[PDB]
A paper describes a structure:
Under conditions of sulphur limitation and in the presence of the inducer, N-acetylserine, [name] binds to cys promoters and activates the transcription of the downstream coding sequences. [name] is a homotetramer of 36 kDa subunits, each comprising a smaller N-terminal DNA binding domain and a C-terminal effector binding domain. [name] is a member of the [name]-type transcriptional regulator (LTTR) family, named after its founding member. To elucidate the subunit arrangement in the tetramer, we determined the crystal structure of intact [name] in complex with N-acetylserine.
The H32 and H3 crystal structures have 2 and 8 molecules in the asymmetric unit respectively. In the H32 crystal form, a crystallographic twofold axis of symmetry generates the [name] tetramer while the asymmetric unit of the H3 crystal form contains two [name] tetramers. There are two protomer types in each tetramer distinguished by the juxtaposition of the DNA binding and the effector binding domains. [name](1–324) was crystallised in the presence of 10 mM of the inducer N-acetylserine. The ligand is enclosed in the prominent cleft between EBDI and EBDII. The carbonyl oxygen of the N-acetyl group of the ligand accepts hydrogen bonds from the hydroxyl of Thr100 and the amide –NH2 of Gln103. Meanwhile, the carboxylate of the ligand forms interactions with the phenolic hydroxyl of Tyr197, the aliphatic hydroxyls of Thr100 and Thr102 and an ordered water molecule.
Author numbering:
A (entry chain B), D (entry chain B): 1 to 323
B (entry chain A), C (entry chain A): 1 to 324
């Protein structure tokens, strides 16, 4: 059978079985129509229309099922012509970044907003994880980039690109013995129960270093992997939170008290990282310099071309990285 | 657009993008098909296939949508001719079923005999195969029904009707250690070389689940599609078969012991099923009911109007189906 | 054989066969560990690891068995110390839970507050992650409990206790086409770019099933592990989010509309679970009951004595769990 | 803690809390035992044994749980020493053959019985399928060999190794108008309803050829992919079966009647096939010559070395292949 026959029998019913009126609507002749209809009935060996004279009188019981399915065939062919084009698919590439939650929510949404404007057909996949985990996916071949924010010793066999420096705040409820006070100390911090990151104390971290040096041992009551849970947890009593300062601002967090701890702990450096055997696509270079605006193609190319991350550190020695 | 163009592109996929093979298949020539393909591409404004040189390498994203719809169009066309058949002469036509060797050999022979006796002018065609091939046969228009025994996620796009639940046996030669000793644990079973289906272990079968639960890995020496090959292999040494309990006959299977493996592996469910676009002729409703007594005509049509195989399951929630 | 040797080989696997990384991790030196490893190999008469030059390339079949057992041995050792803790001072210790961002942010804060109030000398450690990482944390001894929201086949080796059923929402900016129009079909949804979890589409999730049923393929522009990232992304243009309905607040989520996607995707089930080898301290039973009221102590111990998570399910068959 | 401590406390309970008797059984001294026990209790900070004098009096409530788990630790360590060796695993290789059911049940069980004796650590995987399917897996990379028994036009881009020739029988029930008769004909075959293979009639097959040439059209009532179902189906009435002669023998099939059809249809040739880009392992060469004993390594090497299957056909031109 042909699509055309199907069109003709549906149309003959739209026009109330008037074949002459069918012809005018379809820009053809009554013999044209009638030839196709009769050919279809011959092919199928069943009458789709009852006739009395030359005249169509009605659709036969069987014809009614054929016309119903025929209407479905037509509708589907339209649907074929409606199938959207190759530019609706994001198959121009895929970028897999392993990073932190604060980085993805307070840092990168400003970058993501850009990368997607430029590359609307590259798909973007932000995996989160402990410093340990972040570093493992890059090695394993599961991730393109690694945005290490600390414990950068784990990101060992990877290019290391300094992006900025960050500082740990102390967070407390408004009513807390620290909420009204000006500056606070290491000794009188360790006095309180501590709420911080799950990987915060490992035996080599900075939080640790500041307690081992002071011969103090802190009382940890709650840890989480994500800062937003540390903060939600501090909607309670006596605990003291120890997270990134960028994880708290008084606009979103008016129910909390952000409080300098800049002179209490050493500072950290969020680097970006990736395997050396990875062809840097355009969208890759793009993400890097969207995150850190000084990591322009040339800087990166100049950076990777070297032999050791010591040499990149050497390279940025006397340049004030952002804060 | 033309039906022939939709046939051609569907057949190209059916033939694994091998256009020389397609052309032999439809008794025309490669240039005939390519011209038709390219015109469709031109007409739609969409490449259906990625290309290399003279080779087709893959169906594109957009091509995939177009092709899916093309498959529906052609199945509708075959429904038109089936409706005419039904009205012209109800007791005359053909039924194609795709299933496994065990279903054919042990669940169907009776059912078939009955049917052929009632419908001597209906030709019946039984394809045997793996879950993947059963799904394939229904997809390429080679089969009206699937009778599927496991891996039911391969049939989410079909209407599938529950038939019965079944369980597996461990089966060995009478010498074998497990014969003499009582019941068998997964830890015990894991220490021997396993004989089972090619789709026995897939990463997500009932056999996988039992082994993942115990944190064990199976030692697989021999697989086959057909439970009957597997059964001949066990005529030797240490190998332990893992197959359906109904593939073994306490009478006509005299050289094999049949150990209770109901407590190692969970049961599977056998379903019979079709594309929603298949016109259900009277002999087809009969075939379903003869295979599965509780699938009366109203039960079927009731089941077809629902949205999901999960909704169909719900229909049968306050019933207990046969165990086999 | 020595405990230290079993620690070492387990840690080598935990560290992805990276022995330099292992050695840094346990504050000793690579030669220390290699010597211990090789001696174990020598003692057992089995290479645990395949090697290349100075590199470990994979764990061998036999090595895999040995390692699985080694993991049990070490968990038993930690059970000994947990029992001593329980008897010496019940209200003092640590609880480690691994779960998703939404569980932490929206199902736990209350539950936690209650617990910390009753047990001020129990430190609580909440790891957030993907189904794969939740399973990983319990396997490497980093977590006492998993609260798993989907992909439950990743936990066949744990005792898992049903908590509640949950469903997903389609979520968009108020401009978006779908806002204005009524209910949404999968065919409609498939025509937009999707925003969902990194484990949203796996080949066997609830999202896959809905799409396979309709014969459609999703256009995935953005994934993230955390429902909250996904929610910030939808502050833009066309992208349509597919996430849990409880990750969205008709109050504190004011820039997003929440479309009924209960009729596109089937529900999932949130379970809480542990290795059978974990000694259940009193505060742990409390944590379970506080999270899931119907998991009383007897219900738990009743559930642990059963053989399967499927048997556990059966316990709850004549009950209807909470929907969230 | 150490395994040794665990051993000591379990053993002290096996010996009914007599430490001196424990020492003799373990070839050590009472101070030896007692040092480890006390060290464990110190590590755990809980008493495993109640004491009255120097004497053990009983296992404490907590000690009873520790000794129970300790017994489980010991048992597991034994289980480690019981883990079977690398020679219990079939990881020396895997062979994926795509063939027919008759071939796998009446032909290859004699070969399989051999291959497994020689290679007990190569796993063997027999996939079955329509001639079409058999040929597709080889191409796709899912199979190592293809044992085509007919429609060898599908096995196009593959090495083709003739193994033997086979002939189609006719099968019927004892009571059938053909059961007592001697020889039968093409015309009076087409008189009956036909039970044969699902791919039997394609438009190029031999069954076809013999009917197109004779200007006859047969009445097909039942097809199956497997011969055993064709035969089981012929436990009925009037149908006539058309399958391989090797698929029927009067020992297994006494309820049937096998009946020459050698002069009614052309003969077929079961070849073995494989991609040219496939390194023939030892177990591969082995299977080929176990199936066809004349396809010895040298024959195969001599066979593949050529350029066209026409040349292999040329090569076997005047050699009587088996039957
Ligand atoms: C800047 C940042 O994201 N810091 C981490 C801490 O490593 C965080 O998740 O807060
Ligand atoms: C009951 C049944 O047919 N089972 C399949 C395997 O799922 C078989 O072929 O034996
Ligand atoms: C209800 C829930 O927690 N769902 C997961 C996804 O399965 C989430 O993180 O949102
Ligand atoms: C020899 C053989 O196996 N022949 C096929 C027919 O192609 C069969 O399955 O009987």
């Amino acid at each position: 059978m042909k699509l055309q026959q199907l069109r003709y029998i549906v149309e003959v019913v739209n026009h109330n079985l008037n074949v002459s009126s069918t012809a005018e609507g379809l820009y053809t002749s009554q013999p044209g129509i009638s030839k196709q209809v009769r050919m279809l009935e011959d092919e199928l060996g069943i009458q789709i229309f009852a006739r009395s004279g030359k005249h169509l009188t009605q659709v036969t019981p069987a014809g009614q099922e054929i016309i119903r399915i025929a209407r479905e065939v037509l509708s589907k062919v339209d649907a074929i012509k409606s199938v959207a084009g190759e530019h609706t698919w994001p198959d121009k590439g895929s970028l897999y970044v392993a990073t932190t939650h604060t980085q993805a929510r307070y840092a990168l949404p400003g970058v993501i907003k850009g990368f997607i404007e430029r590359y609307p057909r590259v798909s973007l996949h932000m995996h989160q994880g402990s410093p340990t985990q972040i570093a493992e996916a890059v090695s394993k071949g599961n991730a393109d980039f690694a945005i290490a924010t600390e414990a950068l010793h784990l990101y060992d066999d990877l290019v290391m690109l300094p992006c900025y420096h960050w500082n740990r705040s102390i967070v407390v409820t408004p009513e807390h013995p620290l909420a009204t006070k000006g500056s606070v100390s290491i000794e009188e911090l360790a006095q309180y129960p501590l709420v911080t990151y799950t990987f915060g104390f490992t035996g080599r971290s900075e939080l640790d270093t500041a307690f081992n040096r002071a011969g103090l041992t802190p009382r940890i009551v709650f840890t989480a992997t994500d800062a937003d849970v540390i903060k939600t947890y501090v909607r309670l009593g006596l605990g003291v939170g120890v997270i990134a300062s960028m994880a708290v601002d008084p606009v979103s967090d008016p129910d909390l008290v952000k409080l300098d701890a800049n002179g209490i702990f050493s500072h950290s450096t969020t680097k970006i990282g990736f395997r050396r055997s990875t062809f840097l696509r355009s969208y890759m270079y793009d993400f890097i310099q969207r995150f850190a605006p000084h990591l322009t193609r040339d800087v990166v190319d100049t950076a990777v071309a070297l032999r050791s991350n010591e040499d990149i550190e050497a390279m940025f020695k006397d340049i004030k990285l952002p804060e």
